[PDB]
C-alpha cells in the first residue's frame, strides 16, 4: 500500500490485528471427492491453497517402488495469478520450489506411517491460487488436513505457523507486507507437543531474540491445530 | 619446468594434478566399474570423459574439449581387457591459465597430462605413455615457442597442441596422438614445430616418468 505503521504503540498492526492474533482460518475437507482420495481447501487469510492427496496407489512404473514403505511425492504448483502482478516463470524461481517440496516430503515422511503402506506411492498435488505471506506455514496445514481426509495413518498433527520479529516485538501469522519489513520464522509443530518438525529461518535474527520467538511460535501453532481439529469434528458429526 | 602430484583424491580409484605456467587441472579416474545400460560395450571398456571449466557451467566449448581428450586417451587404453565395464575420467580445470574466450589449448594440454597421470594412478591397462605440450608462433618474429605464456598467445599467429605417444623408455615416438593447429601456418612451419615438439615432449615423459616413479615406488615393496 504505502508507508505504514508495523506495530503501533497502541499494539495494533497494519491490518488491524494484534501481536498474538491469527488471520482468519477457514479450512475445508473433502472438496474434491471425484478427483483425489484426500482434499483440503486451505484458506488462511488471503492465502488460498488446494491440496490433493492421491494414494496409496500402485506406482505407475516399478522404478519407484519400495518393498518396505510408501513413497511420498509433494508437488507444489504456484499459479501465475497467486500475486497482484502476474509473475512470469523464472529459471531461478524453480529452485525455491524444489527446496520447499523437499522440505515438505522430509517433514511428512517421518510423521506418516509409511510402513503400513508398502509397495505403494502417495502423490500430494498442491495448487496455490493466492498468496499473501506465511505461505510456507499454510502449505503444511493443507497437507495435514488432506492426508487425514484420505485416511492416511499419522502419528499426530503437523501445524504450520509463521512468526515475525519487528524490533523487539514478535508478531504471529505474518502477511505479505509484514514479511517485506521484518525477519520471518516458519515452524512445523507436532501436535500439542513443543517438538518441531520444521524450522526455517530465512532472515537475520539476534540469537538472544530467537529463544522467545520459538516459544510464541509453538504456542500459536497449537491454536492452529485446534482450528484444524475442530473442522474435522464438525465435518465428522454432520456426516 | 612443470609440477604434478598423484593420488590426491580419496573417494576415486586414481587422481592427479597437473600444473603448467598458471594452468591447473585436477583429474580423477574411477574404473573398472559397473556401466550404465546406455554405456556398456560388449567387448571392450567404455570411457566417460568429463571436463568442467573453472568459471560458469560446462558449455559447448568443453564438449569439443571432451571429444579431443577422448581421441587421445582411447588408443592409449587397453580397452579390450575390460569388457562390459566403465571408466570415469573427470578433469576439473582449477585455473585456465589463458583467455578462455580466445584460447583453449593450454587447458587441453594439461587435461591430457592430468588424465594420463590419473590413469597411471588408477591401474588401468595402458598401451604406452603420453605427453602433451602447447605450441605457438609469434607474429612479428615468426619464432616457434614451446609452452607459451598467456601474453604470448595474444601476440601469436597460430596456436598448436601436440600430443605424442612414447614407448620403450620414453625414447621411441610410436605415433602422434593429437596435433591440433589453428591460425596461420604453412607446410614448412608444421614440420619445423613438429620436429621441435617431438624433442620437448621427449623430455616431458622423461620428467613425467621421474614424477610417477617418485610416488609409486614408496607404495610398492
Amino acid at each position: 500500500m504505502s508507508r505504514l505503521e508495523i506495530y503501533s504503540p497502541e499494539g495494533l498492526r497494519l491490518d488491524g490485528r494484534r501481536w498474538n492474533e491469527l488471520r482468519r482460518f477457514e479450512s475445508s475437507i473433502n472438496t474434491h471427492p471425484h478427483a483425489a482420495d484426500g482434499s483440503s481447501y486451505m484458506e488462511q487469510g488471503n492465502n488460498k491453497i488446494i491440496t490433493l492427496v492421491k494414494g496409496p496407489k500402485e506406482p505407475r512404473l516399478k522404478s519407484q517402488m519400495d518393498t518396505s514403505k510408501a513413497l511420498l511425492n509433494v508437488s507444489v504448483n504456484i499459479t501465475k495469478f497467486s500475486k497482484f502482478e502476474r509473475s512470469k516463470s523464472s529459471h531461478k524461481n524453480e529452485r525455491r520450489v524444489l527446496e520447499i517440496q523437499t522440505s515438505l516430503v522430509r517433514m511428512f515422511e517421518k510423521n506418516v506411517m509409511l510402513n503400513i503402506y508398502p509397495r505403494t506411492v502417495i502423490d500430494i498435488e498442491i495448487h496455490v491460487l493466492e498468496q499473501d505471506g506465511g505461505i510456507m506455514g499454510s502449505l503444511i496445514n493443507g497437507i495435514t488436513l488432506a492426508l487425514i481426509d484420505a485416511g492416511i495413518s499419522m502419528f499426530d498433527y503437523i501445524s504450520g505457523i509463521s512468526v515475525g520479529l519487528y524490533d523487539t516485538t514478535p508478531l504471529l501469522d505474518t502477511n505479505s507486507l509484514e514479511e517485506n519489513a521484518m525477519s520471518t520464522v516458519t515452524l512445523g509443530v507436532v501436535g500439542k507437543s513443543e517438538k518441531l518438525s520444521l524450522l526455517l529461518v530465512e532472515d537475520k535474527i539476534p540469537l538472544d531474540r530467537l529463544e522467545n520467538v520459538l516459544a510464541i511460535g509453538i504456542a500459536g501453532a497449537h491454536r492452529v491445530r485446534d482450528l484444524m481439529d475442530e473442522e474435522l469434528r464438525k465435518h465428522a458429526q454432520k456426516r | 619446468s612443470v609440477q604434478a602430484e598423484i593420488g590426491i583424491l580419496d573417494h576415486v580409484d586414481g587422481s592427479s594434478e597437473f600444473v603448467s605456467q598458471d594452468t591447473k587441472v585436477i583429474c580423477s579416474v574411477t574404473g573398472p566399474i559397473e556401466p550404465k545400460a546406455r554405456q556398456e560395450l560388449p567387448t571392450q571398456l567404455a570411457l566417460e570423459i568429463i571436463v568442467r571449466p573453472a568459471k560458469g557451467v560446462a558449455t559447448t566449448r568443453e564438449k569439443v574439449l571432451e571429444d579431443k581428450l577422448r581421441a587421445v586417451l582411447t588408443p592409449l587404453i587397453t580397452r579390450h581387457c575390460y569388457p562390459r565395464q566403465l571408466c570415469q575420467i573427470t578433469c576439473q580445470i582449477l585455473e585456465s591459465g589463458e583467455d578462455e574466450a580466445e584460447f583453449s589449448l593450454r587447458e587441453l594440454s594439461c587435461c591430457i597430462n592430468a588424465a594420463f597421470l590419473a590413469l597411471v594412478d588408477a591401474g588401468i591397462a595402458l598401451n604406452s605413455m603420453c605427453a602433451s605440450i602447447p605450441i605457438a608462433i609469434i607474429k612479428d618474429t615468426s619464432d616457434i615457442i614451446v609452452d607459451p605464456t598467456a601474453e604470448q598467445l595474444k601476440i601469436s599467429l597460430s596456436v598448436h597442441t601436440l600430443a605424442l605417444e612414447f614407448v620403450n623408455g620414453g625414447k621411441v615416438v610410436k605415433n602422434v596422438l593429437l596435433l591440433d593447429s589453428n591460425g596461420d601456418f604453412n607446410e614448412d612451419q608444421l614440420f619445423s614445430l613438429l620436429e621441435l615438439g617431438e624433442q620437448k615432449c621427449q623430455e616431458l615423459v622423461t620428467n613425467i616418468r621421474r614424477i610417477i616413479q617418485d610416488n609409486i615406488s614408496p607404495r610398492l615393496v
Binding site: - | 560388449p42 567387448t43 571392450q44 579390450h80 569388457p83 562390459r84
Partner: protein
Amino acid sequence: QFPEIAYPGKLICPQYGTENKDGEDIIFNYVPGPGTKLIQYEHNGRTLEAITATLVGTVRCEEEVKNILVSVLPGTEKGRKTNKYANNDFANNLPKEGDIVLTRVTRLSLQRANVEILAVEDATFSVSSDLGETFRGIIRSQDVRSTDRDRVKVIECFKPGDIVRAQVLSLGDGTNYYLTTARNDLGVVFARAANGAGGLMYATDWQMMTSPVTGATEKRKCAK
C-alpha cells in the same frame, strides 16, 4: 484384367468375379493379401466388398471354384533386381517362426546369450546407422546343442561380438526372440580372436575355431 503397376487406392477387383469360358461359367474368389484390403464403396446406395491396393508396386495373383491370392509386391521388377528396397524389406519382413537369421552376440549370461538379429532369409537375405530398426533375440543354454542339452557352458560356445547363424524357435516374451543352434549348420560363422582384438578365426571342428596367422585356438560352437 488388372493393370500391372498399382498405387495405394487403385481398385483392383471385387471379391466375386465371373466369366464364360468354354461354355462353363466359373466364379473367381478374390481374397485380400499382403498389399490389399476389403473396402466398401458406394455408387448407387448399395455397398460392395471390393479389394483395393494399398502399396506401390506390381500386382501378383496366386492360388492355394478356387481362391485367388491377390497381393501387391512393393517396387518395380527392375527395382527388385537392383535391390533398392533393402532397408524397407528388413522392417516389413518380420522374422516369422522357423526362419534362419544372422545375429551378433552382445551379452553373455550364465544360462543365455543375448544377440542382435542383423539379417533374415528372403542364399539371398535381407538386411538394412540412425535408422532405429533392429531386432534382438535370446539363445538359451538349452537350445545351444542337441547332444546333452542341459548342463552346458555358453562361455565355451559364444563370445560377445561373434556372428551366429541360428534358426528361430518362437517369439520368446514379445521383447526377445528364442533362437537355437542345435544343428551342424548352426552356430558361430564369423568370429575374431580375443573378442575382436585378434585375427580372423575360422571354424575347424564342431566345437573348435582357430586363426591362421596368429595360430591361437579358441573353443566355440561352430557351424560346418
